[model samples]
Target: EQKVVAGYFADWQYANAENPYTVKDIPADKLTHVIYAFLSMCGPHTGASETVQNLVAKQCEGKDPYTAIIVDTEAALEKNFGAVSVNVPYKGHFAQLAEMKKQHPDLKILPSFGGWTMSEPFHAMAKNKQAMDQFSKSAVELIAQYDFFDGIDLDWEYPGGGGLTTSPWNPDTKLSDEQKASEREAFTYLVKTMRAELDELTNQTKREYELSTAVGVGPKAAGIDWKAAEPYLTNMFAMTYDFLGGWGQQTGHTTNLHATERSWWGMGADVFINQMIELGIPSEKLVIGAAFYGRGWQGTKDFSGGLPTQDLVSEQGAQFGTGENGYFMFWDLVKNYGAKQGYEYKYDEQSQAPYLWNPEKKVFISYEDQRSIKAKANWAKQANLGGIFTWELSGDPKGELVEVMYQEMQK
Candidate 1:
């Protein structure tokens, strides 16, 4: 079997008029799977707070919590193509993805649920058995109706806790230990129920419907009982990035493959991957993340000539591109930063990380380049791991980083 090379295709990527990316732009040959970034549920969530609960309740007042809907109707269903799916009455991304599936019949496209922001609904749904069952059925029905999706992928920021506006991560809405435990149990049940439902669909359709999840990194891993949910999952995508960002205490590697002595709290992809294995997740069923972007910090005077581990001026990421602060896409990094007037591209041997340092600007950015991406892929293959996946395909529209992964993994 081939190792997986998956990429998340975010629906909002089309908003960038200059560098718009769609299903047709995906390099399907280099990947075994293409996961749609998000398909959220309609819910009256109690996870965030009373304000959030009221907002969700108002939005989903007349909607069923079980149904999954696209977050951006205009971007996902009404933009771009005038054509609609023959199997389902949908246009836009759905139609394009359907057409692409025909060209690459083996590429598995999955509609993922939950992410950093849209994950609040998962907390409410997982706690109720009826809600979980109905959600699973509706997910399967969506796949059946479209006939393009191979299965479903869950990107729940966390199960027990630690998500956007969730407990532990956000102390304002901190959850008790017992309540966290209860949610963990509910999360496992949700996986088991989804697995059972998918199995039934497999029997009926004569094709396998895989289930996978995106996990948190480092200490965040302890929130979910991976051992309990392992049997029900087809793959566990280890989020090996974001070791440090603009929101942190200091500047450092965001996705270093290995840990160095200077590594903050010994955070690295290698440490995170090994932790997953030691936690009972088989190497072959675990996929490590490869970021196609970089995290940079502003107003950082480096005592060591613009290296990582510098204290930030503020707990905020630098504005690298059109998106949020501290975020820099591969394409943007290559075009503006590399070989630019003040910035210098440097490499860290111990951690196998790449970065851009600007002494004058007092900025340090930690990112992945071709060399680092290849190293991670080769390491994964040597470890006999499942494969490597990236955050989003749009970050590297030129297909440079992904191509390195494909070549290294193929070797």
Candidate 2:
């Protein structure tokens, strides 16, 4: 079983963006797998020349000794309302990856289709078998064209329409409980078709092409047609970090230890793991997701959820408070709050999760650290999960968190 698999989500086009070589500085010997930055289909917001060159350098530079590079190819899907009428852009990205692999024969590239934005189309496409088959065929061809991608990574945001938009395939907004169950059946059909096509491709190629999906935490959120897709899926990377965001104006810690009862909104890592196991998905096929960044709040005086709080400030012509704080990007949260409240960051041995509590600021940020990640890695080992999958490498500069996961899982 794979003990450790590390992944990164990077936007290569960002100004002053660090390249893969910087990632090479990371101790590659500690990681068995790595997925690189998203080559978004949003049409080269950062320019394709530099982005392509960096990817090439990453593969050829001999800096990344990774087994896999997961290309984030979600935006290209026609559902995203892109100008590109043909699927060539997505195929082109795969072809580029394949070309890179020619230089680094040891590296395997997988196309990750669907992200938060692409989820809308996935839901609509799931309604019809014909559409599902067409999509599957195109996906297969997209991979085969380059002959580089070793597998597919499905990143459907959520099934049954839980995210930012509703799924057209969702039966009826006013469906009865029974109808809701049947609607779930529609999702199962879509997964079944996709899995069948993937298996067919693998059989024809005479090579093991992995079939994995990125899932949200909890059984309801994962929406895997376990009965249909389990046999074909290599694993499901369950995202445990985003489960506790302030989506409903409810104050809560985005990530926390299992001991933090207030943080378990029915979608924590333990709850998700237990549900998957109960559904008979092998533990080894489940990879826990760790976040390199932390979440925060601005207006709260209570640390009930254990997340950082901020004071109102006049900046950018707006007021900032617990609810009105300026947009705290991943970098700011990691650098500022993390540094000042380092002492508040607690590693819970029992639950194997990390949390931070700043009484002075009356803020608590529940997220993984080197120590907490190590504990989670140990838990994965004990449970026999395939490995751990992190969100993005850029968030953690030192790579200490991922390294800890690697060492702990090996033990």
- The segments of candidate 1 whose C-alpha lies over 4 angstroms from its true place after superposition are 45-63, 82-88, 167-170, 306-316
For residue 343, give model 2's deviation from the true position in Å: 7.2
Q: What is the C-alpha lDDT of each candidate?
A: 0.80, 0.54
Model 1's TM-score against the true structure: 0.92
Number of the top candidate by lDDT?
Answer: 1
Which segments of candidate 2 are over 4 A away from where they belong?
Answer: 11-30, 35-107, 167-183, 248-252, 257-267, 302-334, 338-344, 348-350, 358-360
lDDT of predicted model 2: 0.54
Among the numbered candidates, top TM-score falls to 1
Error of model 1, residue 160, in angstroms: 1.9
Query: Taking the tens digit of each residue's C-alpha lDDT, what string does model 1 give over 30-54?
Result: 8889999877777645444575445
